[PDB]
Design an enzyme around this catalytic site. Structure first.
Site, PDB file in Angstrom:
ATOM      1  N   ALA A  86       0.047  -0.959   5.942  1.00 45.38           N
ATOM      2  CA  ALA A  86       0.464  -1.788   7.084  1.00 45.38           C
ATOM      3  C   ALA A  86       1.759  -1.536   7.683  1.00 45.38           C
ATOM      4  O   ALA A  86       2.881  -1.168   6.494  1.00 45.38           O
ATOM      5  CB  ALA A  86       0.146  -3.249   6.432  1.00 45.38           C
ATOM      6  N   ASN A 110       5.159   0.825   2.442  1.00 44.24           N
ATOM      7  CA  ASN A 110       5.341  -0.159   3.470  1.00 44.24           C
ATOM      8  C   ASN A 110       6.972  -0.357   3.618  1.00 44.24           C
ATOM      9  O   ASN A 110       7.541  -1.465   3.755  1.00 44.24           O
ATOM     10  CB  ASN A 110       4.882  -1.558   3.193  1.00 44.24           C
ATOM     11  CG  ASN A 110       3.439  -1.855   2.611  1.00 44.24           C
ATOM     12  OD1 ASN A 110       3.141  -2.085   1.581  1.00 44.24           O
ATOM     13  ND2 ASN A 110       2.450  -1.552   3.813  1.00 44.24           N
ATOM     14  N   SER A 147       0.716  -1.031   0.007  1.00 40.77           N
ATOM     15  CA  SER A 147      -0.216   0.093   0.117  1.00 40.77           C
ATOM     16  C   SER A 147       0.885   1.228   0.245  1.00 40.77           C
ATOM     17  O   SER A 147       1.821   1.298   0.685  1.00 40.77           O
ATOM     18  CB  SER A 147      -0.837   0.077   1.366  1.00 40.77           C
ATOM     19  OG  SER A 147      -1.706  -0.626   1.619  1.00 40.77           O
TER      20      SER A 147
HETATM   21  O1  LIG Z   1      -0.546  -2.071   3.476  1.00 45.23           O
HETATM   22  C1  LIG Z   1      -1.281  -3.135   3.739  1.00 45.23           C
HETATM   23  O2  LIG Z   1      -0.693  -4.327   3.349  1.00 45.23           O
HETATM   24  C2  LIG Z   1      -2.693  -3.495   3.783  1.00 45.23           C
HETATM   25  C3  LIG Z   1      -2.967  -2.461   4.803  1.00 45.23           C
HETATM   26  C4  LIG Z   1      -3.346  -1.096   4.450  1.00 45.23           C
HETATM   27  C5  LIG Z   1      -3.962  -0.350   5.265  1.00 45.23           C
HETATM   28  C6  LIG Z   1      -4.108  -1.068   6.448  1.00 45.23           C
HETATM   29  S1  LIG Z   1      -3.317  -2.855   6.461  1.00 45.23           S
END
Ligand SMILES: O=C(O)Cc1cccs1
Ligand SMILES: [Ca+2]
Lengths: 206, 557
Positions: B69, B241, B1
């Site tokens: 995440a 991420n 993300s």
């Molecule tokens: O980035 C991720 O893997 C998934 C998620 C996006 C927002 C919260 S968890």
């Protein structure tokens, strides 16, 4: 009026909920969810609780087992039992709203039941606060915040120690799975701050 | 993300712009659900996964928020000492303690029911046991006991009106999740949230610890230790991420690393390229990063250096000159199925060959298969998630940096050969494989593009729709499952906030029993494909102005 919930949908069908207290506000949310996404929510409920095999059979028995081994239901119920009345109202209003539409669907299924319920041969059941909590646990906490490979890490490290000997096996483990790498690009720039903790890198627990 | 947030000093025609593309896979019906809530102290608009009570993406007219995440390490495994002679007990701080246990029965449609037991110790549920060593492993989460409170923190934060109120709710979200802030005055912020353990000295968080008592966590580190920044000197916050901050350790997953090769640098280059950006320019970063090959930048210098002394008729060199003329943006041909340039197929074949010669060779089987993927692996339905740089590619990148990498090269991955020789040998393999299937004229190579599928099964593998409800899109896009943009204090409107999103295939999943599909069942599907978006309404006047229908309920609790 304290009893009234007004639901307005825009040109893309997106619902807006106008209500005066907490319980009524989440009740309208729950209700439009049941209207828009009932089969999807029901299948997510069975997926997060390991009750898939009951409606889809033998191919899902290992799945259901693996889901139930990964949480402790009595711990989640204990957390819901300690909420204050305002917090509890979010969860119970949401489930009561869903239930109001499920009751209408189960009363007039010839026009209201989602086709996939007829396809897959079963019908919707009423929800409780525990079921709402378990949708978040199952799809958020368990999907994105439960990751570990520590056991497999150890098997790798053991194999590297056999191959290269004890001190060397460790140093190759640190080359493949470093603990930190000071050149990784960071969301916060070093001029603003750096992490203060320093960790052990030698498997010192052995 | 990914997420980019642009503050006062970098935004053009507004004071703040937030764009978010959470990647959860692509599904029908839509992974997220759009919902506006007006009352009881709430006044919000947005969309959220599985219709949670709290909106993970949205705004309340004063502040906006979003997530990616976090991937910190908040889980560790405790190796519990069992005893052959008195099962159900484990050694903890000098006494033999009884485990918690519960029995479960799995009902099975058209089959027999199955019952089994689940086991739990003070550190957590038992994952697996080794009878031979009388060891049981228990998975210990820092957030255990805080699942409900984290759902409530994500609900209550939607009422916050400034940074101080918002970070009081961020301090209660215990999962490992990056949170992001922007507001009407042009302030921006970031918090890597969650509960992390306060481990005992000498505990290496990548491997199991004995659960007999001495290694037990001390507690949880304070919220003050969570990486966080407010109004950064750069004027922006970008994440894909990647690591939150210098020296922060990542999840212990063997396939997960934060190294010098990272795909967030692709977003950084675009935001650093322009002194200021408009909303339309912030949205157009989605389209560029969706189509960008992530390994070109990383290995093009190593390729160029290797083939620099080669003649023009050497096909190894021709392959690198094709790559050098390319900007790495993939574009479909007019056939809807092959890409205009063969660069990703070349990098895929080269990188597979390079890993098989270097990292894979240094690791014992069967652990070598963990480092062989090039990152381009897909099937006909296309990738199930975002594209990234593979772990083997990140490890290979440190090795081609030489003593420029901070990671000590305990083994030489090039096994005594000059780097260039291994690079040219892989390039010989790539020419052999590719020219055999396409021929020798590189300019007419029509290589296969990746496609995108909105699956009817949810992420667990379980059906949430009938198989025919699957939707297919010709172009694979490395982008959010939904995208949403919020713009604060636009100079071009009298509204204080403007926001948009796209929730495909659409808001509704309903199909009547006669097969009639809801009117809002697939009206956002073509908008997704063309990078379009729809307005998100907040105020009563806007809502009334766009109303399609109205339903009023009278209910007593
Ligand atoms: O980035 C991720 O893997 C998934 C998620 C996006 C927002 C919260 S968890
Ligand atoms: Ca760990």
């Amino acid at each position: 009026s304290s009893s009234e919930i007004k639901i307005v949908r825009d040109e893309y069908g997106m619902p807006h909920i106008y209500a005066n207290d907490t319980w009524h506000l989440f009740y309208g949310y729950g209700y439009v969810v049941a209207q828009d996404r009932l089969f999807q929510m029901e299948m997510a409920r069975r997926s997060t609780q390991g009750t898939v095999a009951e409606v889809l059979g033998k191919d899902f028995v290992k799945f259901d087992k693996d889901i139930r081994r990964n949480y402790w239901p009595d711990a989640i119920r204990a957390q819901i039992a300690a909420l204050s009345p305002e917090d509890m109202s979010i969860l119970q209003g949401y489930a009561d709203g869903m239930n109001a539409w499920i009751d209408k669907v189960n009363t007039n299924p010839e026009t209201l039941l989602p086709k996939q319920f007829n396809t897959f041969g079963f019908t919707p059941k009423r929800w409780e606060p525990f079921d709402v909590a378990m949708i978040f646990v199952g799809t958020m906490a368990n999907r994105f915040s439960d990751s570990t490979s520590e056991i497999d890490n150890l098997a790798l490290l053991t194999a590297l120690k056999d191959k290269y000997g004890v001190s060397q096996g460790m140093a190759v483990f640190n080359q493949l799975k470093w603990l930190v790498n000071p050149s990784a690009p960071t969301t916060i720039a070093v001029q603003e701050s750096n992490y203060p903790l320093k960790f052990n890198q030698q498997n010192s627990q052995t | 993300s990914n997420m980019w947030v642009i503050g006062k000093s970098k935004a053009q025609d507004a004071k703040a712009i937030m764009v978010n593309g959470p990647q959860f896979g692509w599904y029908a019906p839509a992974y997220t659900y759009g919902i506006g809530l007006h009352g009881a102290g709430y006044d919000v608009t947005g969309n959220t996964p599985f219709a949670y009570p709290g909106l993970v993406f949205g705004h309340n007219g004063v502040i906006s928020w979003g997530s990616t995440a976090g991937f910190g390490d908040d889980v560790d495994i405790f190796a519990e000492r069992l005893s052959a002679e008195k099962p159900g007990y484990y050694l903890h701080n000098g006494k033999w303690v009884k485990m918690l246990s519960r029995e479960e029965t799995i009902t099975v449609k058209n089959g027999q029911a199955e019952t089994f037991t689940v086991w739990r110790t003070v550190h957590g549920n038992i994952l697996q046991t080794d009878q031979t060593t009388q060891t049981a492993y228990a998975k210990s989460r820092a957030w255990d006991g805080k699942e409900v409170a984290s759902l409530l923190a994500w609900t209550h934060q939607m009422k916050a009106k400034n940074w101080q109120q918002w970070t009081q709710q961020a301090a209660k979200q215990a999962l490992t999740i990056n949170w992001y802030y922007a507001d009407v005055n042009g302030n921006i912020g970031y918090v890597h949230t969650g509960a992390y353990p306060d481990r005992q000295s000498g505990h290496d968080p990548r491997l199991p610890v004995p659960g007999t008592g001495k290694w037990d966590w001390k507690g949880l580190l304070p919220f003050e230790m969570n990486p966080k920044v407010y109004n950064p000197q750069s004027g922006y916050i970008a994440n894909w991420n990647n690591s939150p901050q210098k020296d922060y350790p990542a999840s212990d997953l063997f396939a997960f690393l934060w190294g010098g090769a990272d795909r967030v640098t692709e977003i950084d280059r675009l935001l650093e390229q322009k002194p200021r950006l408009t909303a339309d320019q912030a949205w157009d970063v989605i389209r560029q990063t969706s189509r960008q090959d992530l390994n070109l930048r990383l290995f093009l210098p190593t390729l160029q250096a290797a083939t620099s002394g080669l003649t023009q008729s050497d096909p190894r060199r021709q392959l690198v000159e094709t790559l050098t003329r390319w900007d790495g943006i993939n574009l479909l041909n007019d056939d809807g199925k092959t890409w205009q340039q063969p660069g990703s197929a070349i990098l895929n074949v080269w990188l597979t060959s390079m890993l098989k010669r270097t990292v894979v060779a240094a690791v014992p089987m069967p652990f070598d298969k963990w480092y062989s993927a090039s990152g381009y692996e897909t099937t006909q339905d296309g990738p199930t998630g975002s594209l990234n740089i593979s772990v083997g590619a990140k490890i290979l990148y440190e090795a081609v940096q030489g003593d420029k990498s901070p990671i000590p090269q305990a083994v030489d991955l090039f096994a005594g050969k000059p780097q260039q020789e291994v690079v040219l040998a892989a390039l010989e393999d790539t020419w052999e494989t590719l020219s055999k299937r396409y021929g020798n004229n590189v300019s007419n190579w029509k290589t296969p593009a990746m496609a995108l599928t909105f699956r009817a099964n949810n992420f667990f593998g379980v059906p949430q729709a009938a198989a025919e409800e699957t939707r297919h899109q010709a172009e694979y896009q490395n982008r959010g499952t939904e995208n949403d943009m919020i713009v604060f204090s636009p100079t071009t409107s009298d509204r204080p906030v403007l926001a948009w999103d796209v929730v495909a295939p659409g808001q509704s999943g309903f199909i009547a029993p006669d097969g009639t599909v809801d009117k809002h069942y697939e009206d956002q599907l073509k908008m997704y494909e063309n990078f379009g978006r729809k307005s998100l309404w907040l105020t009563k006047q806007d809502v009334e102005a766009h109303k399609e229908s109205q339903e009023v309920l009278h209910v007593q609790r």
